Amino acid sequence: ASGIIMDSSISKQALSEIETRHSEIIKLENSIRELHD
Amino acid sequence: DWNFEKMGIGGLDKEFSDIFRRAFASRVFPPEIVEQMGCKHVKGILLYGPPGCGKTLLARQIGKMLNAREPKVVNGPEILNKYVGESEANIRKLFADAEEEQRRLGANSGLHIIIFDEIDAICKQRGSMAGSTGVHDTVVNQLLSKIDGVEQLNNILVIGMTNRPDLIDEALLRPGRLEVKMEIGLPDEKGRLQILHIHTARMRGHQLLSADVDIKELAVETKNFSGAELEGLVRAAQSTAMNRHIKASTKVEVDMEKAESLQVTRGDFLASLENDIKPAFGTNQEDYASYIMNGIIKWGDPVTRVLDDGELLVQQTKNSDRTPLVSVLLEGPPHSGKTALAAKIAEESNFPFIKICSPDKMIGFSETAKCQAMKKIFDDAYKSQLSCVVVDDIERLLDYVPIGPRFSNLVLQALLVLLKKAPPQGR
Amino acid sequence: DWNFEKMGIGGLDKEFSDIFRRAFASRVFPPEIVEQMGCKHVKGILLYGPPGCGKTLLARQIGKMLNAREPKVVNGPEILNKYVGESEANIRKLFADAEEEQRRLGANSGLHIIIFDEIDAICKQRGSMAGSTGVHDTVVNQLLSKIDGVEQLNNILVIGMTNRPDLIDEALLRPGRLEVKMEIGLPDEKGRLQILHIHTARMRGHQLLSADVDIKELAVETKNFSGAELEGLVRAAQSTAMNRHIKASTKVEVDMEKAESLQVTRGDFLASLENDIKPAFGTNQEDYASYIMNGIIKWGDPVTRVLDDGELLVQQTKNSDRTPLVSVLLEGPPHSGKTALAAKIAEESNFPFIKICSPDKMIGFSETAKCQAMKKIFDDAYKSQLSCVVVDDIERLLDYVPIGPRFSNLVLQALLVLLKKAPPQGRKLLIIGTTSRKDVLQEMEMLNAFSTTIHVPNIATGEQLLEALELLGNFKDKERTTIAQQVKGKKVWIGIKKLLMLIEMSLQMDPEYRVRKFLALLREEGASP
Numbered sequence: 001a002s003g004i005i006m007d008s009s010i011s012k013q014a015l016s017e018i019e020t021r022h023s024e025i026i027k028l029e030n031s032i033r034e035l036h037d
Numbered sequence: 038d039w040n041f042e043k044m045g046i047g048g049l050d051k052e053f054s055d056i057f058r059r060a061f062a063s064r065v066f067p068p069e070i071v072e073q074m075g076c077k078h079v080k081g082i083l084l085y086g087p088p089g090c091g092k093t094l095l096a097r098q099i100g101k102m103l104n105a106r107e108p109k110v111v112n113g114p115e116i117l118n119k120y121v122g123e124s125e126a127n128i129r130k131l132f133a134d135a136e137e138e139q140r141r142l143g144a145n146s147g148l149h150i151i152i153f154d155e156i157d158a159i160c161k162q163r164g165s166m167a168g169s170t171g172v173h174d175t176v177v178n179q180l181l182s183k184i185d186g187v188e189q190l191n192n193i194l195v196i197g198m199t200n201r202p203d204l205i206d207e208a209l210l211r212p213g214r215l216e217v218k219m220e221i222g223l224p225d226e227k228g229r230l231q232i233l234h235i236h237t238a239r240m241r242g243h244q245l246l247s248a249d250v251d252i253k254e255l256a257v258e259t260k261n262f263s264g265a266e267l268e269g270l271v272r273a274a275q276s277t278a279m280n281r282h283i284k285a286s287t288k289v290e291v292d293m294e295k296a297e298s299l300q301v302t303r304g305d306f307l308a309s310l311e312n313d314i315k316p317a318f319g320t321n322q323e324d325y326a327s328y329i330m331n332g333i334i335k336w337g338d339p340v341t342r343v344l345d346d347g348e349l350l351v352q353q354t355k356n357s358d359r360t361p362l363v364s365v366l367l368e369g370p371p372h373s374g375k376t377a378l379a380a381k382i383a384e385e386s387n388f389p390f391i392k393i394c395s396p397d398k399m400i401g402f403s404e405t406a407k408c409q410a411m412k413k414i415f416d417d418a419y420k421s422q423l424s425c426v427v428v429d430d431i432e433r434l435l436d437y438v439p440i441g442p443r444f445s446n447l448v449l450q451a452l453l454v455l456l457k458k459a460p461p462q463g464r
Numbered sequence: 465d466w467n468f469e470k471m472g473i474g475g476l477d478k479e480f481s482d483i484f485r486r487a488f489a490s491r492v493f494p495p496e497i498v499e500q501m502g503c504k505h506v507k508g509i510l511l512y513g514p515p516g517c518g519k520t521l522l523a524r525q526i527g528k529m530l531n532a533r534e535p536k537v538v539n540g541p542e543i544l545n546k547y548v549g550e551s552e553a554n555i556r557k558l559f560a561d562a563e564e565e566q567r568r569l570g571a572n573s574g575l576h577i578i579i580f581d582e583i584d585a586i587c588k589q590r591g592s593m594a595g596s597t598g599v600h601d602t603v604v605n606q607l608l609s610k611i612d613g614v615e616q617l618n619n620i621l622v623i624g625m626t627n628r629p630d631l632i633d634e635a636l637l638r639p640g641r642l643e644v645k646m647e648i649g650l651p652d653e654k655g656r657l658q659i660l661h662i663h664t665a666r667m668r669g670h671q672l673l674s675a676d677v678d679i680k681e682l683a684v685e686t687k688n689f690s691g692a693e694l695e696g697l698v699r700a701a702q703s704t705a706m707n708r709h710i711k712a713s714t715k716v717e718v719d720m721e722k723a724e725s726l727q728v729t730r731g732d733f734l735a736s737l738e739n740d741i742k743p744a745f746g747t748n749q750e751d752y753a754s755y756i757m758n759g760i761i762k763w764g765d766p767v768t769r770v771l772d773d774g775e776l777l778v779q780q781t782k783n784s785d786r787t788p789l790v791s792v793l794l795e796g797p798p799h800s801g802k803t804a805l806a807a808k809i810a811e812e813s814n815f816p817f818i819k820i821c822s823p824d825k826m827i828g829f830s831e832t833a834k835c836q837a838m839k840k841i842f843d844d845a846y847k848s849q850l851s852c853v854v855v856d857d858i859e860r861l862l863d864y865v866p867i868g869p870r871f872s873n874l875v876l877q878a879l880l881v882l883l884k885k886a887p888p889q890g891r892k893l894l895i896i897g898t899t900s901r902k903d904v905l906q907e908m909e910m911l912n913a914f915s916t917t918i919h920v921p922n923i924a925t926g927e928q929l930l931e932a933l934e935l936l937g938n939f940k941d942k943e944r945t946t947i948a949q950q951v952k953g954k955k956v957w958i959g960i961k962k963l964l965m966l967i968e969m970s971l972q973m974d975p976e977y978r979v980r981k982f983l984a985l986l987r988e989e990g991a992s993p
């Protein structure tokens with residue numbers, strides 16, 4: 001009964017979903033800053 | 038609500054008494070007194086014996102007697118795996134809860150039970166030189182380190198079962214480790230009576246058992262039966278009785294006419310005892326019909342003399358106490374009827390155990406196979422209060438041939454050593 | 465607040481003295497002196513010996529006598545992992561704290577104990593399986609290069625426990641690595657006394673031990689018991705004492721009126737000795753009950769002569785000092801009583817270790833297995849201050865058969881080499897051997913290994929036969945007067961075992977047909993002296 005072995009591993013970047021689009025909220029702050037001005 | 042009468046174990050009073058005294062005696066005494074002594078608890082039990090005598094039953098009843106947690110079970114070698122260091126992970130996963138609870142609660146933790154089944158398939162002698170070995174070394178080392186190591190556990194109990202008690206490691210059987218060893222063997226008359234009374238208590242409750250049957254007779258007519266056969270006998274009798282009430286055999290239905298009068302009679306018991314069940318430590322009446330093919334004919338004077346000599350030897354080997362072992366050799370010219378006379382002398386002795394070791398069941402075997410077969414037959418013979426073994430055609434066993442001469446030395450030495458080895462005391 | 469008596473270890477004064485002297489002596493001296501000398505500190509301890517003699521207890525206690533961190537424990541092969549390059553990471557994780565606190569606090573840090581358990585499971589010899597098993601050649605290298613490498617450490621200590629000290633690597637035992645090597649062996653009488661005192665102190669403080677139990681008797685009566693066996697004996701006695709009150713006939717009920725008079729009596733100790741505990745380097749009363757099956761009866765003069773010669777041999781081996789190894793050969797005709805006399809001579813020597821190497825337990829073995837079994841028994845016999853061994857029925861131990869002749873050569877050579885190998889210095893051994901064919905043994909040049917020979921004779925006179933019958937007590941009154949009339953007028957040549965068999969065979973006839981058949985059997989056997 002030959003046995004006792006090993007292995008190697010790899011990975012994958014699964015969080016492909018973009019996030020930059022929802023982070024460009026600056027313009028709304030600019031408009032409300034103008035309102036407060 | 039526990040009481041011994043509901044466990045359902047017969048013929049094992051002394052073994053259970055000793056187990057209870059040694060293992061559970063200090064867990065039921067008042068804790069102050071046990072604290073004023075400073076004694077640790079016992080940590081294992083080992084059960085061994087022939088197959089069919091009630092090992093697993095006892096462990097199951099012990100497991101479901103205590104108020105402990107549901108016991109773990111390991112069904113043979115189900116921890117082994119083909120990757121590196123994957124068996125030891127499974128070995129370590131068993132003792133985690135005990136460690137956690139011991140660390141948390143202290144001296145108020147409950148009992149944890151682990152049940153190893155067929156323990157000789159994992160724990161084997163480690164070895165001495167850098168040869169053979171395997172996963173056994175690592176598994177055994179891990180088990181030994183876990184049971185008794187540098188951290189002290191005081192809330193476990195380990196039970197082991199095995200048929201071959203000569204293979205297990207020695208470092209695993211010292212006091213502190215599994216130190217209670219018990220042997221479960223064939224029962225005696227009281228044991229058979231108790232078992233037969235246990236296995237037919239329901240039927241008598243509903244008046245399903247006829248008035249003819251007398252248990253004290255079946256306790257006498259069944260010699261060298263084990264529990265697993267004293268159960269099968271009753272089951273076969275019940276099956277015959279039930280089948281007697283089915284006239285629609287080609288079809289499948291019930292008459293529903295005399296079923297109100299369903300009852301188990303003595304005839305079913307006798308028929309089943311004479312047809313179905315065949316013990317394994319007893320006499321079977323098929324050999325004598327295959328070795329005595331034309332019966333014994335009294336053609337002269339010598340036949341009676343030979344039979345008388347056999348009778349005298351048989352009588353001697355049963356009453357004497359200085360000589361618990363006897364031997365005798367029947368010899369003559371070819372074509373004279375030696376095997377028939379030996380078989381007839383053996384049949385008329387009423388010994389509970391009889392067996393024949395002939396060379397026509399060993400065609401093509403080498404030396405070691407023949408040695409093992411002979412040794413097995415004698416080992417079986419050493420487990421009955423009386424015995425009788427026949428060794429026929431000695432010269433065919435040794436593989437003798439005048440040219441040469443040539444023969445087997447190993448078989449000869451095995452036979453010469455077995456001819457003068459007394460059995461255990463009392464047999 | 466450390467006090468030796470608190471440790472609770474008995475029978476190991478010298479070993480602890482040496483461990484303290486070598487390992488903890490340069491850490492408990494004023495720093496200036498230890499610095500002027502310019503000496504480093506020891507970095508290991510190894511402990512090996514037979515099972516049950518108190519190794520792990522010593523490591524556990526050494527772990528509690530140091531005002532240091534909490535020791536790290538490795539339970540057997542607890543580091544192996546299936547992925548590539550994870551076992552070495554597990555091994556490197558153990559020294560991280562030591563390396564970090566050495567690089568900051570300089571020469572003012574504290575010890576970092578580490579305890580390897582069953583070190584022989586992951587540290588076997590290198591280059592032993594064609595590059596090892598793949599993971600047993602990098603683990604060893606990593607351990608070697610981290611205990612003592614290019615970067616220097618001075619604040620660690622490693623303790624190892626093992627049962628087989630021959631499989632460990634050689635490069636791991638040099639004086640720069642695990643260096644202090646000790647052996648934990650069986651105790652002697654004054655060790656057993658201390659062990660019993662340690663394990664019985666608590667009971668004798670609350671008056672739970674009945675005045676009547678004397679510890680000297682227990683110390684004397686337990687020969688070659690380990691520590692574990694003594695603990696088990698005490699525990700079994702306590703369990704027997706407890707169980708008297710409990711009742712389990714119908715339902716468990718603990719009596720509470722008699723529980724206030726609990727006391728452990730000596731009968732419990734005797735019962736536990738008899739039935740429960742069986743030692744491993746001692747002797748019991750079962751081998752002798754199996755070999756000396758019908759006792760021994762003095763039917764004549766020679767019987768006493770043999771025993772006196774055996775006693776002289778035993779005395780010589782026990783006292784003298786030039787010759788620590790003596791052997792003797794008992795020979796005679798078949799069916800004469802050779803094994804019974806050997807067992808009787810051995811049992812009345814009071815040596816602690818007594819074994820019987822017999823062919824009854826090697827049925828079907830090849831010759832390699834026979835060599836291994838013999839070697840293992842003789843290896844066990846070398847670890848006691850006095851040993852006796854018996855070799856039984858040699859001609860069956862070589863597979864001798866007149867045709868050819870045929871026999872085994874490996875076993876013969878092992879025997880011839882094992883009769884001239886003296887034991888480790890200071891210990892004494894005795895070897896007895898029985899055979900029924902002296903001329904064959906002579907032909908093989910096996911009568912020079914043995915130092916002396918003894919002859920076991922047959923019954924050869926009428927008076928001796930009648931005395932044997934009188935001792936056994938089977939034929940009495942008129943019957944005797946018949947035999948005396950018939951046998952005295954002739955000579956006889958018969959063995960004792962065959963005499964027992966003949967008497968038993970004769971006793972099966974009718975009450976008035978016994979003596980005649982007995983005489984017929986006695987005559988038919990034939991003497992042929």
Ligand SMILES: Nc1ncnc2c1ncn2[C@@H]1O[C@H](COP(=O)(O)OP(=O)(O)OP(=O)(O)O)[C@@H](O)[C@H]1O
Pocket residue numbers: 045046047048049087088089090091092093094095232235264265266268
């Ligand atoms: N002492 C006994 N009293 C009553 N019934 C018994 C007794 N011994 C065995 N039996 C019956 O026979 C059955 C035998 O099964 P059990 O698991 O006890 O056998 P075993 O000998 O442990 O098994 P194996 O030989 O395969 O290891 C039990 O389930 C029970 O039905």
Ligand SMILES: Nc1ncnc2c1ncn2[C@@H]1O[C@H](COP(=O)(O)OP(=O)(O)OP(=O)(O)O)[C@@H](O)[C@H]1O
Pocket residue numbers: 328329330331332333334335336340370371372373374375376377378
């Ligand atoms: N009085 C008798 N004694 C022996 N056998 C008899 C007698 N009467 C009839 N027979 C039959 O004679 C046959 C004897 O053959 P058997 O096999 O016993 O011979 P054997 O002595 O073993 O032979 P072999 O020399 O070939 O080994 C058997 O069928 C036996 O039933």
Ligand SMILES: Nc1ncnc2c1ncn2[C@@H]1O[C@H](COP(=O)(O)OP(=O)(O)OP(=O)(O)O)[C@@H](O)[C@H]1O
Pocket residue numbers: 208213472473474475476514515516517518519520521522627659662691692695
């Ligand atoms: N000198 C001693 N004094 C007191 N108790 C002792 C002594 N030696 C051994 N013991 C007892 O032995 C048990 C501890 O045994 P330990 O763990 O040292 O076994 P070991 O022989 O080193 O291990 P193993 O044989 O399983 O590899 C405890 O019961 C301890 O009381």
Ligand SMILES: Nc1ncnc2c1ncn2[C@@H]1O[C@H](COP(=O)(O)OP(=O)(O)OP(=O)(O)O)[C@@H](O)[C@H]1O
Pocket residue numbers: 457755756757758759760761762763767797798799800801802803804805857900960961
């Ligand atoms: N005085 C005696 N000397 C020796 N044995 C005696 C004596 N009295 C009784 N016996 C019994 O006689 C038997 C002696 O037989 P033993 O076992 O020594 O056989 P043996 O000489 O080795 O035979 P074998 O020829 O098979 O090697 C034993 O039962 C022993 O108890």
